[PDB]
Paper text:
Using standard single-particle-based helical reconstruction techniques, we were able to produce an initial de novo 3D model from the 2D classes which could then be used for refinement of the irreversible fibril structure of human lysozyme to 2.8 Å resolution. The structural model comprises residues 22–34, 50–128 and an additional 12 residues whose sequence could not be identified, covering more than 2/3 of the amino acid sequence of human lysozyme. Apart from a region of tubular density which could not be modeled due to its low quality the remaining 1/3 of the protein, including the segment 35–40, is not visible in the cryo-EM structure, indicating that these segments are dynamic or heterogeneous in the structure. Further typical structural motifs of amyloid fibrils are present and include hydrogen bonded glutamine/asparagine ladders (such as the buried residues Gln86, Gln123, Asn60, Asn75, Asn88, Asn118). Furthermore, a complete unfolding of the native lysozyme is necessary for the irreversible amyloid formation as the sequence elements of both the native helices as well as the β-strands of the anti-parallel β-sheet of the native protein fold are incorporated into the amyloid fibril structure.
By combining atomic force microscopy, cryo-electron microscopy and solid-state NMR, we show that a full unfolding of the native protein precursor is a requirement for establishing irreversible amyloid fibrils.
Numbering used by the authors:
A (entry chain E), B (entry chain G), C (entry chain I), D (entry chain C), E (entry chain A): 22 to 34, 50 to 128
């Protein structure tokens, strides 16, 4: 992931030292984010998958999906209609 | 994940030292986020999956999904209609 | 997850040292977040799944889903209609 | 992932030293991002997959998908129509 | 991934030294990005896949997809229509 380290040492027989660390930080910003909007989809025998990860830091993900065995998807004579469909997405 | 360490040491026989760490921090910001809005979908024999992770830090996720055995999805003569469908998504 | 450490040491035979750690913190901000809004969906023989994690720190998740054995989803002659459907999502 | 280290040392028998680290940080910015908007799709026996990762730092992802065994997708005489469909995406 | 290191040393028997590191940072910018908008697609027996990675730093991804075994996709006499379909994408 992330590893930081900061050291100082001295010996004897003025000083003003600075360490400033700023990784994912935001200052005076107007951030905005709008991932993954879905509208008016028709799914008959179908899959939709989304990872809408908006801001992760040092995050870990592990996935196993459908290792083994029969999948059958069958469709016939289905009727799907979208009419006058509008999507406005404005992550301003 | 995230590992930080800070050390200081001295020996003898002024000083003013600073350590500032700012990882995912937000200062004076106007952050806003709107992940994963879904509208008016028709699912017949269908799946929709979303990870709308908005801000995680050092988070860990482990998933196993449908390892083994028969899946069958069957659909016929279904009628699905959308009419005058509008989605407005505005993560300002 | 997250590990921090802070040390100081001295020996002999002024000083003013600082350690400031600010991980996921928010200062003076106007944060807002609106993950995962769902509207007017038709699920016939269907699944919808969402992880709307908004702000987690150091969080851990472990999942197992449908390891084994028959799934069958069957639909016929179903009628689904959406008419004049509007969704407004505004995570300002 | 990310590794940083900072050292200082001295011995004897003024000084003001600085270390500034700014990795993924944003200052005075008006950032905005809008990944992965989906509108009005028809999926008969079909898959749609999206990774809408908007801002990750040091993040790790591991995936296994459909290792083994029969997939069959069958569709016939399906009718799908889109009429007067408009999408506006404006990540300003 | 990314490795930084900073050292300082002295011995004896003024100084003001600076180290400024600015990797993926943005200053005074109006950045905006809008990857992967999808509109009005018809998928019969088909797959659509997107990685809409918008801003990753030091991120790692590993994927295994469909290692082994029969895939069959069959479609006949399907009718798909798009009419008056307009898409506007404006990552200003």
């Amino acid at each position: 992931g992330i590893s930081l380290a900061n050291w100082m040492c001295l010996a004897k027989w003025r000083s003003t030292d600075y360490g400033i660390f700023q990784i994912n930080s935001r200052y005076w910003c107007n951030d905005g984010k709008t991932p993954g909007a879905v509208n008016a989809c028709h799914l008959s025998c179908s899959a939709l998958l989304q990872d809408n990860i908006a801001d992760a830091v040092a995050c870990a993900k592990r996935v196993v999906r459908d290792p083994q065995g029969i999948r059958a998807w069958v469709a016939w004579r289905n009727r799907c209609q979208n009419r006058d469909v509008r999507q406005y997405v404005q992550g301003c």
